[PDB]
Amino acid sequence: REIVHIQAGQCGNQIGAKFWEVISDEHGIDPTGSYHGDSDLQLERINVYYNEATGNKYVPRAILVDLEPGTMDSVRSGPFGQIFRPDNFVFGQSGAGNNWAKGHYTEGAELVDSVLDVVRKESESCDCLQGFQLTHSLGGGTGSGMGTLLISKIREEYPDRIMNTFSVMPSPKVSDTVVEPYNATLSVHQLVENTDETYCIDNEALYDICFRTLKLTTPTYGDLNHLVSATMSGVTTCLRFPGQLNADLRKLAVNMVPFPRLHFFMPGFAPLTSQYRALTVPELTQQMFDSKNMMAACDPRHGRYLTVAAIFRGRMSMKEVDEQMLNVQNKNSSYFVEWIPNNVKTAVCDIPPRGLKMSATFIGNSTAIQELFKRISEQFTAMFRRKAFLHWYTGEGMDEMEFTEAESNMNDLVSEYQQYQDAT
Amino acid sequence: IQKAIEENNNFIKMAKEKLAQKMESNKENREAHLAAMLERLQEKDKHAEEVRKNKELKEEA
Numbered sequence A: 001r002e003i004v005h006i007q008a009g010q011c012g013n014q015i016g017a018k019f020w021e022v023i024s025d026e027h028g029i030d031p032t033g034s035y036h037g038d039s040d041l042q043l044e045r046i047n048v049y050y051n052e053a054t055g056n057k058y059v060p061r062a063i064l065v066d067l068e069p070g071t072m073d074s075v076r077s078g079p080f081g082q083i084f085r086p087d088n089f090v091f092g093q094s095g096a097g098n099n100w101a102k103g104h105y106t107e108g109a110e111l112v113d114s115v116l117d118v119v120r121k122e123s124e125s126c127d128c129l130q131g132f133q134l135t136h137s138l139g140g141g142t143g144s145g146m147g148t149l150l151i152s153k154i155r156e157e158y159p160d161r162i163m164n165t166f167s168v169m170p171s172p173k174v175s176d177t178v179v180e181p182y183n184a185t186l187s188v189h190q191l192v193e194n195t196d197e198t199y200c201i202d203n204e205a206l207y208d209i210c211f212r213t214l215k216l217t218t219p220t221y222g223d224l225n226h227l228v229s230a231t232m233s234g235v236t237t238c239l240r241f242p243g244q245l246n247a248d249l250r251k252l253a254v255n256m257v258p259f260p261r262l263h264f265f266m267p268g269f270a271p272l273t274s275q276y277r278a279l280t281v282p283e284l285t286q287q288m289f290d291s292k293n294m295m296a297a298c299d300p301r302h303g304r305y306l307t308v309a310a311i312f313r314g315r316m317s318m319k320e321v322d323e324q325m326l327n328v329q330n331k332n333s334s335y336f337v338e339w340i341p342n343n344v345k346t347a348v349c350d351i352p353p354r355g356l357k358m359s360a361t362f363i364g365n366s367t368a369i370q371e372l373f374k375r376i377s378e379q380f381t382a383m384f385r386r387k388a389f390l391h392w393y394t395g396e397g398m399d400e401m402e403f404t405e406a407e408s409n410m411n412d413l414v415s416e417y418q419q420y421q422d423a424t
Numbered sequence B: 001i002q003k004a005i006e007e008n009n010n011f012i013k014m015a016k017e018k019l020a021q022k023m024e025s026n027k028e029n030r031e032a033h034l035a036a037m038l039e040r041l042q043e044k045d046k047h048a049e050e051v052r053k054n055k056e057l058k059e060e061a
């Protein structure tokens, strides 16, 4: 079941490069694309993310997109630069200037057809494509605007294929420009309409984890992307390794999304790294459900869990795991809805990640994700009520009306979450 | 996108129009000032011609 990967913009490309590094390591592929691992469990599900090339080299089914060549210069030079198919570097020369309008309407539109050509030529070589995954930020212009435009186009061309995203939310504590709430607000609406699952990675949470928990006084984007790549590896673990259930993207989405618009997930990971202590299953579960281990800066106790999936990795006792999970639930059971019976599920992968003997990845569909959207909305409004900086967008053809619509759709989305938080 | 193009073109057009109008108006104004000053000097020459003509009408007396 093949997956097509797309990474757009600076943040998108950086996080995608780290993800490919991580999973290439896990699958035993070296930077040249040659396999040098030590198990066939590494290969049984390797066609999901890699094409088999001449000489039986393995090449990621990844399309790299940017409106400027910088980050893709670095990527093509970096650790795993030479593994990406050269044709799949699709770039422009100008940039998007952290402007959603430039990425979605002006500069991006000039290149979206070129990108879709590579998307198509990758899809044709798929025995049965199960869907797409995109990595991008919502606070910039290329990732944000052009990736949402690409998602719209892909839905047009592949209306019946799963579209999932790892989307990095902006946060003032780690910020590049002040117009991030605008871009984010306009992107989120797009996602609400055009993604089956969006894993909300909040840089606020990443920074707070790297500072308060890993005790890193001056976190760089690399330190946050370490966590993001760990989570991305965890989320996709069940599809990349053979010991697991039989579910494509569509089945997992079907069981994790009770309502179409409420498909924004809170990722989580444990333990947090940047040690040799063997971590125990009870500690894994407790940390995994701890808010301090989660990538979205929301308090799960201010909301309720619609569905929960946990992927443990490592050699552990499934009996102990499943006792500890049942502990953490039956104990704190006021934060799980009673109208979705048995909404917590757990998988255990006999293969661990690298550096860690036991890890747990947390995917939670919680109504507490509100707290992120209201945050963004507040920032949005705090500027939009004075039309502040709107000239950046009006100069590229946008009308205030559109900003008002984007504000309203997200305030609606917040309200929908409130509706399912009170239901009994 | 077409609205963005339309506004860029509109800005260029009105920049050009207002500048052309300004330069035309300035040329007209400076030309009028010079012309007035030149005609004033000519009328001055005239008064000069008149008085010098007058000198000839008293010597014949």
Ligand SMILES: Nc1nc2c(ncn2[C@@H]2O[C@H](COP(=O)(O)OP(=O)(O)O)[C@@H](O)[C@H]2O)c(=O)[nH]1
Pocket: A009, A010, A011, A012, A014, A096, A097, A098, A099, A103, A137, A138, A139, A140, A141, A142, A143, A144, A145, A168, A169, A170, A171, A174, A175, A176, A177, A180, A203, A206, A221, A222, A224, A225, A228
């Ligand atoms: N996690 C993470 N976030 C980033 C990184 N670089 C930028 N961002 C965030 O994304 C926004 C900038 O988006 P950018 O990557 O420039 O995409 P573009 O502007 O569309 O090219 C900023 O608001 C940052 O908070 C990164 O390396 N890692």
Ligand SMILES: [Ca+2]
Pocket: none
């Ligand atoms: Ca151009």
Ligand SMILES: [Ca+2]
Pocket: A113
């Ligand atoms: Ca074409």
Ligand SMILES: [Mg+2]
Pocket: A010, A140, A176
């Ligand atoms: Mg940037």
